[PDB]
Write a protein that binds this ligand. Structure first.
Ligand SMILES: OC[C@@H]1[C@@H](O)[C@H](O)[C@@H](O)c2nnnn21
Length: 437
């Protein structure tokens, strides 16, 4: 058997734009994901978050599912433009009311809320003012965070400033694959820097407003292996993984190989901001899904090498040992006081069998192998306090639309019916047992 520590927090995770629908209901302003997905060509099949899982209406049923599964924590995000429709200034009470009901319901049911302040649905109004490219976003984000803290901090005691700032910056502003859909490397590195500044101002406000809670930040991470006999791997870790942000937070500068590649793209006097960026955080959240084989390639000087390994429906190679590696590595590099795995999961081509069930043994195998590796890191002294499955529900998978199903609960979009998958049942047992067997 593999038993986890007493009080270990087993959770599931979602994000507002991916599940809620009703993006313009009750006075909400448009987000950049609304306008991006409504632009032809940006999302597969022309899919948008207009309806999604209809969680905006079905939230109580969904939380009742979390409760019934015995899951102990729910990580969800708040839509900024539901709360401040123009990004700054006016606060929308109906937007606050929506999350107030979710929070109170979770608490009544003994489920711990983990709130992600920003999971990519920037107010459109702020994008018109340059969004993450504008230094003033540190102020806008601080003001938004303060509203959340003032309204919810009496009840929510666990906060995440940003989901995956690497993705927000690079995928949104260099690759142009995510909102706001830009391709400018100078803008992308300014977004990196402002994401750190905004995160730090929000932590600063947190210390002044919620003297009894904890706050951290969440990073995407992959397990990069060299295609042979190495520095391309060092570069990928430093750039794509937690070091891009934790080196500033803990050490007051970007990682060495990031500075090699990208110095010319950062603001000239970026070091001036580093003392403020070191604002103390309470925990680090690591997301982890996939591994990659990496070679130097003269034509970021880096390319991936395809491996004959099992893959998910995303085409992502399944490499469970990567979750152990990333957990050991974060301890070794920055020794954060607490770590959470804030996302782990997989997309597979789920179908409802004639028996009414969704037999996703593939997802069970995936989760089991990763949970086992996380257990290993704990035995070796990593202060892992919780693990969150992405996702509770099949949902809007960004530029892939509804074509990729990550839920432990199946959503039939024609009816909005939820069907707990075999993986959901399996996970509920893991949680009940506080581990594997
Ligand atoms: O792509 C699947 C999921 C997304 O749905 C989440 O929104 C995002 O936080 C993430 N990071 N890595 N994998 N994911």
């Amino acid at each position: 058997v593999k038993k986890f520590p007493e009080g270990f927090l087993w959770g599931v995770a979602t994000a507002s734009y991916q599940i809620e629908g009703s993006p313009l209901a009750d006075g909400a302003g448009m987000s950049i994901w609304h306008t991006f997905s409504h632009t032809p060509g940006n999302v597969k099949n022309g899919d948008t978050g207009d309806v999604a899982c209809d969680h905006y209406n079905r939230w109580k049923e969904d939380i009742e599912i979390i409760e019934k599964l015995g899951v102990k924590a729910y990580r969800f995000s708040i839509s900024w433009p539901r709360i401040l429709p123009e990004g700054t200034g006016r606060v929308n009470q109906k937007g606050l009311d929506f999350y107030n009901r979710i929070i109170d319901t979770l608490l009544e049911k003994g489920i711990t809320p983990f709130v992600t302040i920003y999971h990519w649905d920037l107010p459109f109004a702020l994008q018109l003012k340059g969004g993450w490219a504008n230094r003033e976003i540190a102020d806008w984000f601080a003001e938004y965070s303060r509203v959340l803290f003032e309204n919810f901090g009496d009840r929510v005691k666990n906060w995440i400033t940003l989901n995956e700032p690497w993705v927000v910056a690079i995928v949104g502003h260099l690759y142009g694959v995510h909102a706001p859909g830009m391709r400018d490397i100078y803008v992308a590195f300014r977004a990196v820097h402002n994401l750190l500044r905004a995160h730090a101002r929000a932590v600063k406000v947190f210390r002044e407003t919620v003297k009894d809670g904890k706050i951290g930040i969440v990073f995407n991470n992959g397990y990069f292996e060299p295609a042979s006999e190495i520095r391309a791997v060092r570069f990928m870790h430093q750039f794509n993984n937690y070091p891009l942000f934790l080196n500033p937070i803990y050490r007051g500068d970007y990682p060495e190989l990031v500075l090699e590649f990208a110095r010319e793209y950062l603001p000239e006097n970026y070091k001036d901001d580093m003392s403020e960026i070191q604002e103390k955080i309470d925990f680090v959240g690591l997301n982890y899904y996939s591994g990659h084989l990496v070679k130097f390639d003269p034509d970021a000087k880096v390319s991936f090498v395809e491996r004959d390994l099992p893959k998910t429906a995303m085409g992502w190679e399944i490499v469970p040992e990567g979750i152990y590696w990333i957990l050991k590595k974060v301890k070794e590099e920055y020794n954060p006081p607490e770590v959470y795995i804030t996302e782990n999961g997989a997309a597979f081509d789920d179908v409802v069998s004639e028996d009414g069930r969704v037999h996703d043994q593939n997802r069970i195998d995936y989760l089991k192998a990763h949970i086992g590796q996380a257990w290993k890191a704990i035995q070796e002294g990593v202060p892992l306090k919780g693990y969150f499955v992405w996702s509770l529900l099949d949902n809007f998978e960004w530029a892939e639309g509804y074509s990729k199903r990550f839920g432990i609960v199946y959503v039939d979009y024609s009816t909005q019916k939820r069907i707990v998958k075999d993986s959901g049942y399996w996970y509920s047992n893991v949680v009940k047992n506080n581990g594997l067997e």
